[PDB]
Amino acid sequence: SWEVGCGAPVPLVKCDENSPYRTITGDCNNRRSPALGAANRALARWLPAEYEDGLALPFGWTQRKTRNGFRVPLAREVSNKIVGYLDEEGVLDQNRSLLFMQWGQIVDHDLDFAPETELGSNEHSKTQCEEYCIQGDNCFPIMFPKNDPKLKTQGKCMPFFRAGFVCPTPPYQSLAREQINAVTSFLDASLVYGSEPSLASRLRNLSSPLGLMAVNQEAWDHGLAYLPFNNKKPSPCEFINTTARVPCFLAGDFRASEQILLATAHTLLLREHNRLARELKKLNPHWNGEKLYQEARKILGAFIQIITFRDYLPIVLGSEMQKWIPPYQGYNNSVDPRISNVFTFAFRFGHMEVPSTVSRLDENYQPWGPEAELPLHTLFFNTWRIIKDGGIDPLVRGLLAKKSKLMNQDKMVTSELRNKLFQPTHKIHGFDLAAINLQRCRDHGMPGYNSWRGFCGLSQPKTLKGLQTVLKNKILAKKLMDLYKTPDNIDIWIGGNAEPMVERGRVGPLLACLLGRQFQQIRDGDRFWWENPGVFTEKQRDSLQKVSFSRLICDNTHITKVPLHAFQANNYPHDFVDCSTVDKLDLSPWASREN
Ligand code: HEM
Ligand SMILES: *[C@@H]1O[C@H](CO)[C@@H](O[C@@H]2O[C@H](CO)[C@@H](O)[C@H](O)[C@H]2NC(C)=O)[C@H](O)[C@H]1NC(C)=O
Ligand SMILES: *[C@@H]1O[C@H](CO)[C@@H](O)[C@H](O)[C@H]1NC(C)=O
Ligand SMILES: *[C@@H]1O[C@H](CO)[C@@H](O)[C@H](O)[C@H]1NC(C)=O
Ligand SMILES: *[C@@H]1O[C@H](CO)[C@@H](O)[C@H](O)[C@H]1NC(C)=O
Ligand SMILES: O=N[O-]
Ligand SMILES: O=N[O-]
Ligand SMILES: [Ca+2]
């Protein structure tokens, strides 16, 4: 890097080199380089940033500044002409449950968060971005093209604020701008426990010595725990229904209530922690609060690793799985475990797997009540539909029995996300996640499609006919060439997602490469990886080998009918089995006879 040692939060790291638990912040994982993979550091750059001014300004910022001699298209125009579709008939994934989409969002939240720069206080600035659509400093609004229906109902732009960056946070440094990752790069259940000391502690039950996570005190799920409420204003979850006045949940990750199924998934994970901590107490009555907390946390971290690497990545990466994530050979301390800037875009392939509706199903996996099925847009920042309309169980059934959207070159992102997205502070269900993704690519200084094709050892199409052959799609290639005049200029999110999916996977070759490398690195570069000799005992790892999502559900809801393979498409009752069929987590290897 241009000038090494520019970090604002570098010190305050007393690494206890025998401490057997992960830190919350991810510091002290790597011994030689203790900040590697820790939160609140720069995202890694696998390739040098590309900004219109070499330093900081996004391509598209200045009108008369070309990229390789062509203007970059408006993000919303690309969204409208390539990404949008009308007909939700036929879009569903006949071999992936809705859990497959949801696990992806969960894993993503474990690994990366690049928050908007801090300008939250009352001011003209953020409201003048919204109101007057005035580009400047961190305000980089998504301007509507002519012929955009939203022009007629919403104004001239959708607000957008540039991502935070390290070193000077209002002024800048002399290398290219580097965006921050606010969570730990390690797959470590940071979304459950938090990535900062403050939050980690606020989330805990330190009022009793049982090592429990705090649970909700105002509401219960047929006895089972809910996440605690986050009691700060303005609250988006209150804003979406002022009558119900039900707040957002408080979880290790800030985004937990963005949609009801993510909130759902967070609820399972918290309950798992508590069930593990109570189960541990009995087997080790002598263990204190810290000990029980840390040992539950460690088990939950392992669970997420296994589900991810054994269950999830094989049906994303398909044939490429082995090529990028060969079987584990042990911790390598030479591996950079940091999340890359490009990965935070590559893993947005999930956006094309989100379907337009969510169902609540009853115990016979039939519609729960008269509005069992709801449009996804009514479920952003929606906690009241959990609290006051059946709790978790009906939503979890729908995750099992309903299907993900299938990526489709003609039907990429459902209008529920493309046209009706809600964002805190902006008051309308009227934003476009696709447009935001594209603007964010520019904001983060992303190299274009051919740069990444080059990086990944893939052919770099220079013409329409070349692009037609790579996309295997003449009309999409044409639309991409008409908007971006060269494939060199195609934004990586749309370019990557445009490629046909590899055999037995759900992403194309380029994304398989970007994803596969990242996941290989977060495994191989993790000192606390579950299968690393020493982290667990031989017998502990024999127990952990048997975890399943199916089992998580059985332990932590009142559901009794589960598939064995929760991520594939399952129909009830054919592909469902009683919970007693399903292997448990045997915790007897954690018995410490410690006398
Ligand atoms: C209803 C479902 C979902 C909603 C509403 C949603 C919404 C969002 C929003 C608002 C952002 C912030 C975008 C920005 O300002 O740049 C975002 C970012 C992201 N989403 Fe999604 N998303 C969903 C599902 C998923 C899924 C299924 C995945 C992956 C399988 C995923 C992966 C990501 C990633 C990686 C980011 C970038 C995070 C970062 O590093 O900052 N999302 N999503
Ligand atoms: C806000 O939440 C309330 C409940 O907290 C929603 O509905 C209640 O909702 C339906 C009425 O259509 C029934 O369950 C009850 O008769 C209602 N009770 C109350 C307290 O009014 C209401 O529809 C929500 N509104 C929106 C726009 O989401
Ligand atoms: C913590 O534990 C005690 C006893 O287990 C319980 O009664 C109390 O409500 C818990 N506190 C919170 C807020 O989770
Ligand atoms: C570990 O990582 C480095 C990174 O390039 C690689 O060169 C080396 O061969 C690896 N060694 C082992 C044993 O994993
Ligand atoms: C469906 O998906 C699974 C992976 O989840 C795969 O192994 C299986 O062969 C597929 N079966 C069908 C019905 O295509
Ligand atoms: O209350 N905040 O999501
Ligand atoms: O989940 N996104 O804020
Ligand atoms: Ca993490």
Side-chain angles (χ1 to χ4, degrees), residues 101 104-105 108 112-114 160 255 258-259 312 344 347-351 353-354 376 380 417 421 423 433 436-437 440:
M101 178 282 296
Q105 195 181 27
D108 185 283
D112 49 277
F113 189 22
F160 174 107
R255 299 158 285 182
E258 179 265 351
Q259 55 96 0
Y312 180 69
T344 78
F347 211 173
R348 299 185 195 212
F349 75 79
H351 292 168
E353 299 176 355
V354 185
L376 168 75
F380 307 133
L417 285 174
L421 181 71
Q423 310 215 279
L433 183 57
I436 290 162
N437 286 341
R440 194 64 78 195

Side-chain angles (χ1 to χ4, degrees), residues 7 28 104 168 196 221 223 279 330 575:
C28 307
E196 301 150 296
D221 188 7
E279 187 60 359
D575 305 306

Side-chain angles (χ1 to χ4, degrees), residues 229-237 247-249 254-257 381 424:
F229 291 123
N230 182 6
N231 292 120
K232 72 181 55 182
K233 284 85 185 63
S235 177
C237 304
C248 301
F249 290 122
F254 161 81
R255 299 158 285 182
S257 301
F381 296 97

